Amino acid sequence: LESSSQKFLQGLVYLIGNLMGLALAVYKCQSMGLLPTHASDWLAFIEPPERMEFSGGGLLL
Amino acid sequence: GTVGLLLEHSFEIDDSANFRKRGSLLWNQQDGTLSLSQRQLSEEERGRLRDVAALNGLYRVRIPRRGGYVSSFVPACSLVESHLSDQLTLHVDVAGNVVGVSVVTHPGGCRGHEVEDVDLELFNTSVQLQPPTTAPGPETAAFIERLEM
Amino acid sequence: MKGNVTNVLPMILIGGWINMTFSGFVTTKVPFPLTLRFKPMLQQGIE
Amino acid sequence: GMSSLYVFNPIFGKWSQVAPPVLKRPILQSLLLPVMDQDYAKVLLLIDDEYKVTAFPATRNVLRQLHELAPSIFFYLVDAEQGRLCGYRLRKDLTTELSWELTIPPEVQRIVKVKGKRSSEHVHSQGRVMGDRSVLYKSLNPNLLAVVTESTDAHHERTFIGIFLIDGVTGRIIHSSVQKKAKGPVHIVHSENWVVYQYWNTKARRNEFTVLELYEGTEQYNATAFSSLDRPQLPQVLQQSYIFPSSIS
Amino acid sequence: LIPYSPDVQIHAERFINYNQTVSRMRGIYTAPSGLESTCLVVAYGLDIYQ
Numbered sequence: 001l002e003s004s005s006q007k008f009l010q011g012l013v014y015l016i017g018n019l020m021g022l023a024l025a026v027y028k029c030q031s032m033g034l035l036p037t038h039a040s041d042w043l044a045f046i047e048p049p050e051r052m053e054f055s056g057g058g059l060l061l
Numbered sequence: 062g063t064v065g066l067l068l069e070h071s072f073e074i075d076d077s078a079n080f081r082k083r084g085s086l087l088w089n090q091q092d093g094t095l096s097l098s099q100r101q102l103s104e105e106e107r108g109r110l111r112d113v114a115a116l117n118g119l120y121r122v123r124i125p126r127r128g129g130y131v132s133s134f135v136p137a138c139s140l141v142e143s144h145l146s147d148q149l150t151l152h153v154d155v156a157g158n159v160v161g162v163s164v165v166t167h168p169g170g171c172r173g174h175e176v177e178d179v180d181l182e183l184f185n186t187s188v189q190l191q192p193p194t195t196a197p198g199p200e201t202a203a204f205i206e207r208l209e210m
Numbered sequence: 211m212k213g214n215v216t217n218v219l220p221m222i223l224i225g226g227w228i229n230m231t232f233s234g235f236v237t238t239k240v241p242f243p244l245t246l247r248f249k250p251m252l253q254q255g256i257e
Numbered sequence: 258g259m260s261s262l263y264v265f266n267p268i269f270g271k272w273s274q275v276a277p278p279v280l281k282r283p284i285l286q287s288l289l290l291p292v293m294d295q296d297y298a299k300v301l302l303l304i305d306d307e308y309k310v311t312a313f314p315a316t317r318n319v320l321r322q323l324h325e326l327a328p329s330i331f332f333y334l335v336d337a338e339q340g341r342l343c344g345y346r347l348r349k350d351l352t353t354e355l356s357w358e359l360t361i362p363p364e365v366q367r368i369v370k371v372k373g374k375r376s377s378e379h380v381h382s383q384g385r386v387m388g389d390r391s392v393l394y395k396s397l398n399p400n401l402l403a404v405v406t407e408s409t410d411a412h413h414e415r416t417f418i419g420i421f422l423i424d425g426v427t428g429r430i431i432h433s434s435v436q437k438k439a440k441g442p443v444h445i446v447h448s449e450n451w452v453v454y455q456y457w458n459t460k461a462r463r464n465e466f467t468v469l470e471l472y473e474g475t476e477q478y479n480a481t482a483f484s485s486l487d488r489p490q491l492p493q494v495l496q497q498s499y500i501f502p503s504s505i506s
Numbered sequence: 507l508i509p510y511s512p513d514v515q516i517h518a519e520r521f522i523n524y525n526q527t528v529s530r531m532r533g534i535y536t537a538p539s540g541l542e543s544t545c546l547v548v549a550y551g552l553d554i555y556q
């Protein structure tokens with residue numbers, strides 16, 4: 001595309017268009033629910049903590 | 062109808078066999094107001110309390126009921142690490158019967174940085190009442206109206 | 211109709227028949243951590 | 258009032274050559290220690306009337322581990338005729354000390370059944386989803402006992418049915434629920450965090466089904482090590498009622 | 507969710523005991539199996555059934 005100085009700038013606008021298209025795609029991706037970014041999805045991963053100082057008893061008395 | 066309750070606290074190295082009078086609690090059954098009035102601790106008692114905290118001991122509270130004896134244990138290490146903040150709760154039946162008490166501390170931590178002599182001067186306590194609660198029953202009247210409407 | 215590189219209809223039909231034959235099944239797990247919004251995608255037959 | 262203990266094999270049937278003597282008064286209560294020692298075997302200790310702990314698998318390493326734990330094991334005993342819910346704990350080597358005490362008037366209420374949490378139970382999900390996407394944390398207590406009390410007097414209208422939720426570690430009632438027109442056989446089932454108890458109503462001839470559930474808030478605590486000494490919070494309690502046309506034996 | 511309604515009917519389809527019945531139901535014991543979703547249920551009392 002290099003033929004003059006002014007079109008070298010229009011190439012940047014051509015790139016900016018695809019950049020904003022990628023931004024739109026990311027916005028739709030996040031609105032759908034593709035990217036987790038949420039507490040429930042991290043709770044899908046949390047491992048149960050250890051139990052300490054156990055007790056016990058009954059009613060035999 | 063105003064009745065006084067006796068509140069004793071425990072302080073030892075590792076066992077617990079000594080009990081002393083800390084203050085008087087006033088309870089009025091008909092209204093439902095609970096008031097506390099306890100004396101201030103001496104310097105020797107404060108030092109013993111600080112020594113017990115570093116020994117991760119136990120803080121037993123005795124509340125005789127008119128007889129029965131109710132005791133509750135609470136870690137004093139968190140009490141000393143944080144500011145003095147105890148919460149007392151009486152448990153009653155549907156009639157004039159006493160079940161027991163529990164002492165609860167809001168901080169409830171185990172970091173244990175340091176305690177300053179300015180901190181342990183005043184006692185910060187709150188007494189609350191927890192009467193039994195009535196559970197709900199089947200809400201069939203609303204269901205019948207919803208079906209009709 | 212509008213024939214445009216017809217290769218998607220056969221694969222879709224084959225996958226649909228394979229899923230219809232196998233109602234409740236567990237084939238394999240994927241090591242990749244996946245979100246819970248793709249669960250209707252993946253199981254489609256397991257309660 | 259004699260107590261004896263046998264050590265047999267569940268596969269073949271022949272008993273082993275290891276059996277401990279029993280003396281003093283009859284054995285009061287026992288619990289199974291999760292910790293294992295000797296070869297691959299777990300430890301069983303029992304309580305006598307003199308308030309002493311007796312260990313079945315006498316082993317130097319067993320005693321070493323028990324002394325290492327020391328303030329880690331608690332004991333709650335429940336009496337019906339006495340109506341006293343008192344607790345003890347181990348100190349240093351082997352000695353009984355009172356920690357938390359509870360008394361209930363026998364003339365008003367009477368203990369019927371006491372259920373707890375099963376030792377072999379693992380939870381997969383520690384929370385639940387809510388309306389939009391926000392998460393809701395549960396309240397799981399490995400050390401918590403539910404006691405059921407019934408009215409001594411039996412009348413057409415005057416009937417008292419209630420359940421007390423107490424912690425066996427520290428004397429503290431979480432939730433205490435009471436009915437007004439319930440009488441008859443009461444069945445209670447305890448689970449991960451929800452309690453299912455059934456009763457019968459004298460006013461209207463029917464069986465009502467009450468389900469109780471414990472729920473925490475939106476934010477979690479430490480969630481690395483659970484203990485009843487800490488965690489100064491009161492979980493939310495949810496109740497609902499249904500109708501079941503049966504007896505539920 | 508399903509709208510709340512205080513009516514529970516005993517469906518005949520959800521009947522584990524099709525023919526074999528227990529005269530007196532003292533208790534039942536549930537044991538977890540090893541696969542994932544299998545529990546061995548044994549009902550004791552006047553008879554034994556598994």
Ligand SMILES: *[C@@H]1O[C@H](CO)[C@@H](O[C@@H]2O[C@H](CO)[C@@H](O[C@@H]3O[C@H](CO)[C@@H](O)[C@H](O)[C@@H]3O)[C@H](O)[C@H]2NC(C)=O)[C@H](O)[C@H]1NC(C)=O
Nearest residue numbers: 143144145146147148167168180181183184185186187188
């Ligand atoms: C003596 O006791 C009283 C009452 O127990 C204490 O007042 C309480 O002080 C705490 C913090 O000092 C307050 O906590 C606050 O809670 C709000 C939400 O409610 C939160 O947004 C704040 O960031 C803070 O955590 C509490 O509300 C307040 N009142 C109570 C508990 O009823 C008082 O601080 C105690 N004095 C000393 C010297 O400890």
Ligand SMILES: *[C@@H]1O[C@H](CO)[C@@H](O[C@@H]2O[C@H](CO)[C@@H](O[C@@H]3O[C@H](CO)[C@@H](O)[C@H](O)[C@@H]3O)[C@H](O)[C@H]2NC(C)=O)[C@H](O)[C@H]1NC(C)=O
Nearest residue numbers: 049050052169170171172173478479480481482483484487
């Ligand atoms: C949540 O609970 C866990 C478990 O109780 C806490 O982790 C533990 O925290 C204590 C106190 O900081 C650590 O004790 C440390 O011991 C060393 C000597 O071994 C001492 O030099 C330190 O000054 C400290 O006292 C303990 O090691 C640590 N355990 C683990 C496995 O990390 C945790 O701090 C709690 N978190 C919150 C936010 O409450």
Ligand SMILES: *[C@@H]1O[C@H](CO)[C@@H](O[C@@H]2O[C@H](CO)[C@@H](O[C@@H]3O[C@H](CO)[C@@H](O)[C@H](O)[C@@H]3O)[C@H](O)[C@H]2NC(C)=O)[C@H](O)[C@H]1NC(C)=O
Nearest residue numbers: 517518519520521522523524525526527528529553555556
């Ligand atoms: C509940 O149990 C009774 C038995 O006390 C069932 O009746 C019997 O059911 C069996 C099969 O479960 C029948 O056996 C059949 O026999 C024919 C030949 O006669 C054979 O070709 C079949 O393959 C089968 O083995 C038996 O005839 C039948 N007896 C009577 C008198 O009806 C009853 O069906 C059970 N209830 C059910 C299954 O809902």
